[PDB]
Structure formats: C-alpha cells, structure tokens
C-alpha cells in the first residue's frame, strides 16, 4: 500500500523531510504560544462555521437566531460560548506570542517579513473581533459598529468614501450588517488564511530563530 | 540529542545567515509533533471548554439606534487606544496615535537592526522600551475603566 | 470589584507557577525512579 502511494506521490520525500527537522534546546514552552494561537484560530473556524447553519444576517432576524442557538440548538450554547471565549483567547495568546518573539529577537534579520506578516495577521484577528460582535445586532455590537465604522471620516477627502464603503451607505443599517457578515465569514478568514500561510512558509524555510 | 557540527560548512554557512537552528537538538517527530502537540491542544481545549461551561455567553439587548448605552466600552484589547481617544483633545491627533501602534510595531524589525543581538540582557534600550511600553499600555487600559477625570492617574 | 480582577489576576500567576513546579516534581520522581 505504502508502495502503491509512494510509487506515485513519493510519500517518502514528505516523510523524510518531516523527520529531518530538529528542535534546538533554546526552545522554551513559550515557543508553543504561536501554535496555541493557531489552535484557537482553528477552533474559531470550526465553531464559527457551525453557527453558519443557524445564524441569520438581517436586522429583522439576527438577534433572534443568536438567541435560538443559545436556547434550542443542540449544544448551541456551548458552541457560541466557545466561539466567544476562544476569540478572546486567540487575541490574548497572540499578544503573549509577540512578547515571546520580541524577547528572543526572533524578528531580527532575517525573519523581518515573518514579523510583518504577523502584524498584518494581528490586524485581521482584531478585525474578526469587531465584525463578530456586530452579528447578533445587539446594543453593544451595534454602537461599536457605529463608532469604529466612523473613525475613518477623520481622513481628508477619501474619509467619507470609506465610511460609506464600510456601512454600505450613509449610516449604520442592514447593508452594514450584510457587509460585516461577509467580512467576518468570507474575507477575514480568506485573508488571514493567506498571511497565516506566508507566516508558516517563511518560518519553515528559515527554521526557528537562534539561541538566547 | 544531536549537537551541531561546527565543522560542517553547510551549517556554518547557515549559522552565518542566522539559520540552521532547526538542524540540531532533539528530533521534532514524533517527540513533539506527534506526542506533545496533542497534549498542548487538549490542554487548550479543556481550558476553553472549561470557561465556556462555567461562564456561558450572554445575550445583550437588541440594538436601539436611538439610544446609546450609558456605559459603553470596547473589547479589552482596545482599552488603551480607547483611553488615548477620550483623554486626547483633537479628534485627529487621537486617531493618528491609534494608527501609530500597528504602524510603529511593524517598524521594530527595521528601526532595531543596528544591534545584532537576541537576548534582552544584551539589548538594554530595547528592554527598557518594552517594559516601559508595557506599563504604559496596561496603565492606559486600566484607566479606560475609570472616569475621564481620574483615568490618567487611576485616582492616585 | 477591582479587587476581584486583581484577585483573579494574582490567582493565574499562582496557578502558572504551581503548574510548572509540579512539572519538575514529576521529572524528579522519574529521576528517582531511575
């Protein structure tokens, strides 16, 4: 069987590669944080996709569907709560990860792009948080949208144009909810996934930073 | 174990570029990958599911575009920026400082290349700035939960 | 309740160190079981 596959995919190569890798002794437990973060992201994906089978992204039925998940969906409460808690954890873990990286200088030449990509991911993550809280269309999430979504008008010229793109028009309405859902369940994932891939690829290419 | 062979030109070459560190030490597989990873992933799952059960998510009140909650706060991680905003006069100067963060962060690797070191003890100024910056961020954050009047001193 | 968060905070610091410690505790036992 291995034969069958190895004879047309060369499992070996992959295997052999995975084996060749070593973990140098300067690798603390703190070096697990990047991966914990990743673990949190994956949890978010699963847990998030799951609510996609119940949540309704419209001003008229959003708050309701969320409640339904909390009250009728099997383990619906457990799922949402996990999505909620794990989102907070992803951010916190990310912060700790940065701490680790900074206090080991793992960002100094090379790896500079590894850090840059990271910061972008940091933004995506934080972005996930904001769009997320708007979905149930509750007082907090709402006003949060209003405020954040407004900030951009401070830029001359383009400012207003941007606010309207983010709100799908003047003021926060359904369109805002609509675009936001798309951002949370389609764009941000896509984007994050992309940069996360770069982070990983580069990390793999250059190996962990050195000792001390 | 497997010590690095500083005789090998290949390795020396890498060490020069700051690489090859993943070529010595303990095998990654199955040692960490197959055995430890699950341990960490499970620990993580436990902790999160723990919190989820004991402290479930709450529903708010439906959005009312005609009434803004009196006590309206952002997510904890925004607390610092939030504070900067309410505490700073200009509406622009405030927003700039905000953007400054990610902007400046994404700079560190470049405006900190003159020094070839990693260990914090061989990077005096950096250590100070980090520590320094940490207090500032934490302080501002805690402050955002206080009344604008006293937030900048936390009533002290 | 600012005491509560400070409490919770300190608690985590506590839990963390205890954990690591018990870690070495085991390592030590393994060692002795040598």
């Amino acid at each position: 069987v291995y034969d069958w596959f190895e004879e047309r995919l060369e499992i070996q190569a992959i295997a052999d590669d995975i084996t060749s890798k070593y973990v140098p002794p300067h690798v603390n437990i703190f070096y697990c944080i990047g991966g914990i973060t990743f673990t949190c992201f994956l949890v978010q994906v699963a847990t998030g996709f799951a609510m996609t089978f119940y949540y309704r992204p419209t001003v008229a039925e959003a708050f309701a569907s969320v409640q339904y998940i909390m009250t009728d969906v099997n383990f619906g409460w457990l799922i949402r709560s996990i999505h909620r808690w794990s989102a907070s954890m992803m951010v916190l873990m990310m912060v700790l990860h940065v701490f680790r990286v900074y206090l080991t200088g793992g960002f100094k030449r090379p790896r500079e792009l590894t850090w840059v990509t990271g910061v972008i991911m940091a933004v995506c993550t934080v972005s996930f948080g904001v769009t997320g809280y708007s979905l149930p269309w509750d007082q907090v999430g709402y006003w949060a949208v209003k405020i954040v979504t407004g900030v951009p008008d401070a830029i001359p010229g383009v400012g207003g144009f941007i606010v309207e793109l983010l709100r799908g028009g003047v003021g926060v309405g359904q369109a805002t909810l609509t675009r936001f859902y798309s951002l949370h369940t389609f764009v941000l994932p896509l984007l994050t996934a992309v940069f996360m891939l770069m982070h990983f690829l580069m990390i793999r290419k250059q190996g962990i930073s050195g000792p001390l | 174990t497997k010590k690095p062979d500083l005789s090998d030109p290949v390795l020396k070459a890498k060490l020069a570029k700051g690489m090859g560190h993943n070529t010595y030490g303990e095998p990654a597989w199955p040692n960490d990958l197959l055995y430890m990873f699950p341990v960490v992933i499970l620990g993580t799952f436990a902790c999160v599911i723990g919190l989820s059960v004991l402290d479930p998510a709450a529903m708010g009140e439906p959005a009312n575009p005609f009434a803004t909650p009196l006590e309206i706060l952002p997510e904890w991680y925004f607390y610092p920026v939030f504070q900067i905003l309410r505490v700073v006069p200009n509406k622009l100067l405030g927003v700039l400082l905000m953007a400054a963060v990610p902007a400046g962060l994404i700079t560190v690797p470049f405006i900190e290349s003159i020094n070839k070191f990693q260990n914090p003890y061989r990077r005096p100024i950096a250590t100070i700035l980090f520590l320094l910056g940490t207090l500032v961020a934490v302080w501002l954050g805690i402050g955002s939960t206080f009344p604008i009047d006293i937030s900048l001193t936390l009533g002290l | 309740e600012a005491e509560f968060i400070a409490g919770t905070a300190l608690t985590m610091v506590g839990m963390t160190l205890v954990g690591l410690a018990i870690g070495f505790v085991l390592l030590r036992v393994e060692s002795l079981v040598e």
């Binding site: 703190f30 001390l212 | - | 919770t8 963390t16």
Partner: peptide, 30 residues
C-alpha cells in the same frame, strides 16, 4: 461593559509570561 474574569486572566498572564521570558533569557545569559 467590562469583562472582569477575562480582564483578570489577561492582567494575570501578561506579567507572569513576560517574567518567565526574562527568566529563561537570563538563565541562557549565563
């Protein structure tokens, strides 16, 4: 609205982590 427990966890782990990092970093320094 403030999330006490969460905040507790944050304010707790942030320092204990930073500390550990300086500790391991020190150990290597010697």
């Amino acid at each position: 609205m403030v999330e006490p427990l969460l905040c507790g966890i944050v304010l707790g782990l942030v320092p204990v982590t930073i500390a550990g990092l300086f500790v391991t970093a020190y150990l290597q320094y010697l």
